[PDB]
């Protein structure tokens, strides 16, 4: 027919704004949180432990009701945001968890209330979604309102998006002149499930130009100081011969400059020959021990290589091939940046940054509060056992800690206890 005009572009933009709106990100994040994150958090640790009288518990489905208001008279009624604003109340809905006892004489539907989660207005669990214009006017709510905010103590609270650096990526930077380290490679590790940061690992290239004696490359892991040179950790992951080391690091044999730069690493690491001696050296330099004999050293080294060493890749034994391949790729990137072939990564690049909305922050807060509640209920059940009494499974749970924590965090803004 004809080319696309400006009016067609404005029609497309109008369709975009009609379907999504202006505060679509807030509502989408909160809906995803309330739909998936709560269930994921409660199923993350569904095993609470304490014939061999194996007392077991089960965490079941999570049930959400409409935001209800309960008073001193005990009557519970449906509550709307206007009433909460007028009476300085909190717009929240109760959460029910299927805490089931599975005693079952050892090896040979309770709907327990766990707290009240504040409800974002105009979100899928709010009461103002399917309500039409006439009833919106009836409920003293402006139809022009867009939602996307909570109501705490009759005050409207909005969660500002939090800008952070992206995790599970490798970034290489330079260093100032008065420092032995010339270039640095950094990665922040966070597993996909929950998107929580565990630990960070940092690879450094010691040795300024015409200085620093040996130009060794040293890794820095969590749960350890006295950073270990990278060749020893290569040998510790289970790759003994040096030819395989250079094959992992350098993917092109024609790059003689990379091999020449890597030669000091081989010269320094020649003192270590086998995997066991490298593991023992790591255990001796691994802290968290002081003369605790060789077996504990090798056990701690096995734990620190299987876990906390790039946990975002894997956390189980027998799968160290991809771990050492990623580590070799990281070393190759660091050496490429050091060889003045690739420019250092820009920290201001907006594509390497993430925005935490209400979803992830509420997920982390709920995880912390659930951990605190589990600790409190564990203390209560152990006290009940040591006092030789039978609990009703309903007085042990304290919804007050979760409710108060969420309310205080949202009201004050201090994201913590």
């Amino acid at each position: 027919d004809d080319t696309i005009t400006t009016e067609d572009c404005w029609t497309v933009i109008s369709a975009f704004f009609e379907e999504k709106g202006l505060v679509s990100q807030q509502l989408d994040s909160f809906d995803e949180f309330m739909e998936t994150s709560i269930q994921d958090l409660v199923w993350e640790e569904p095993r609470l432990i304490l014939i061999n009288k194996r007392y077991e518990i089960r965490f079941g489905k999570i049930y959400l009701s409409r935001p209800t208001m309960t008073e001193a008279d005990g009557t519970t009624h449906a509550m709307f945001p206007q009433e909460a604003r007028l009476r300085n109340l909190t717009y929240s809905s109760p959460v029910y968890l299927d805490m089931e006892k599975s005693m079952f004489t050892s090896i040979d539907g309770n709907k327990v209330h766990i707290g009240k989660v504040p409800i974002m207005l105009r979100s899928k669990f709010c009461s103002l979604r399917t309500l039409d214009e006439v009833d919106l006017y009836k409920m003293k709510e402006c139809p022009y309102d867009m939602g996307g905010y909570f109501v705490i103590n009759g005050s409207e609270k909005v969660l500002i998006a939090q800008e952070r650096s992206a995790a599970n990526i490798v970034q290489v930077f330079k260093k100032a002149a008065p420092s032995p380290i010339s270039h640095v490679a950094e990665i922040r590790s966070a597993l996909e499930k929950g998107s929580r940061l565990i630990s960070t690992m940092q690879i450094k290239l010691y040795g300024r130009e015409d200085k620093g004696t040996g130009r060794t490359i040293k890794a820095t892991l969590p749960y350890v100081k006295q950073d270990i040179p990278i060749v020893i950790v290569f040998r510790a992951l289970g790759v003994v011969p040096d030819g395989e080391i250079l094959q992992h690091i350098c993917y092109d044999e024609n790059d003689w400059q990379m091999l020449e730069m890597l030669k000091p690493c081989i010269e320094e690491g020649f003192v270590i020959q086998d995997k066991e001696v490298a593991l023992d050296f790591i255990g001796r330099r691994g802290s968290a021990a002081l003369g605790i004999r060789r077996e504990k050293r090798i056990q701690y080294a096995k734990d620190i290589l299987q876990k906390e060493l790039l946990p975002h890749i894997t956390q189980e034994e027998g799968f160290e091939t991809r771990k050492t391949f990623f580590l070799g790729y990281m070393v190759n990137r660091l050496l490429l940046c050091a060889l003045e072939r690739k420019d250092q990564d820009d920290r201001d690049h907006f594509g390497k940054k993430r925005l935490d909305l209400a979803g992830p922050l509420l997920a982390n807060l709920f995880r912390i509060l659930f951990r605190k509640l589990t600790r409190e209920i564990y203390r209560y059940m152990q006290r009940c056992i040591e006092t030789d009494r039978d609990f009703n499974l309903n007085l042990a749970v304290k919804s007050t800690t979760i409710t108060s924590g969420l309310k205080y965090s949202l009201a004050t803004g201090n994201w913590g206890e």
Binding site: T11, V12, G351
Partner: protein, 239 residues
């Protein structure tokens, strides 16, 4: 196109507080298992049987920041995954990046990625409509009607997105695409008007191959900056 270039506070918060653009969005997060299944079905080789002696030209494939394997035909895989994303089988908020210089294939399904929508320009040489917008007047008519010509469904923004005419791109993917500011820039114009502004010559390249087109440049502004009449005739501190 992701944050407002004009709206920012003054003082200790200058530059540290930003406002999202009108078309800007935030990724929610999608499972990565279907991506891995599609990659394995399309001939991706794992790292267990990686031989660097023979795989000196194979491109590495990164999913959510981890190295999952290698491939020998990056172009076909990239085209197939882009087509699958444009057809709605893959979530539209999935970032697909092909670094030709570094020989890398990055796939991102993380949460918190900021993306904006853009028109899609035909890229394949076999197609007769190469160099033109995939969206035609039929799509505009269907949008205005509110239904597809076949009540049963609604023809809105999602219908346009799943039809392969509008796609979301984030900051990382933007380095791998060529964008035309206006649809009139998609056709090489063949006067001497003293009133209208002068467009850039863009004569440094003999031929241009645009892969995307902006819906409207004024969408790069924020909510507060959209109130200013004629912001392009002002000074930026005044905005």
């Amino acid at each position: 196109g992701l944050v407002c270039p004009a709206e920012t506070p003054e003082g200790q918060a200058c530059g540290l507080v930003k406002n999202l653009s009108l078309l800007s969005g935030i990724s929610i997060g999608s499972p990565s298992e279907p991506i891995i299944n599609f990659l394995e079905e399309w001939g991706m080789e794992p790292l267990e049987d990686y031989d660097p002696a023979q795989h000196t030209k194979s491109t590495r494939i990164f999913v959510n920041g981890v190295w999952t394997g290698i491939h020998r035909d990056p172009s076909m895989l990239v085209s197939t995954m882009r087509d699958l994303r444009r057809s709605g089988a893959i979530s539209p908020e999935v970032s697909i990046i092909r670094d030709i210089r570094e020989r890398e294939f990055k796939i991102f399904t993380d949460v918190g990625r900021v993306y904006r929508p853009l028109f899609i320009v035909e890229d394949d040489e076999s197609k007769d409509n190469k160099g033109e917008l995939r969206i035609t007047k039929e799509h505009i008519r269907k949008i205005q009607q509110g239904y597809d010509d076949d009540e049963q469904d609604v023809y809105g923004w999602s219908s346009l997105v799943t039809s392969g005419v509008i796609e979301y791109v984030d900051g990382e993917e933007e380095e791998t695409i060529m964008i035309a500011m206006t649809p009139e820039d998609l056709q090489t114009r063949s006067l001497n008007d003293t009133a209208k502004r002068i467009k850039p010559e863009m004569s440094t390249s003999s031929h241009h191959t645009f892969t995307h087109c902006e819906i409207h440049p004024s969408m790069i502004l924020g909510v507060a900056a959209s109130i200013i009449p004629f912001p392009d005739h002002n000074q930026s501190p005044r905005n």
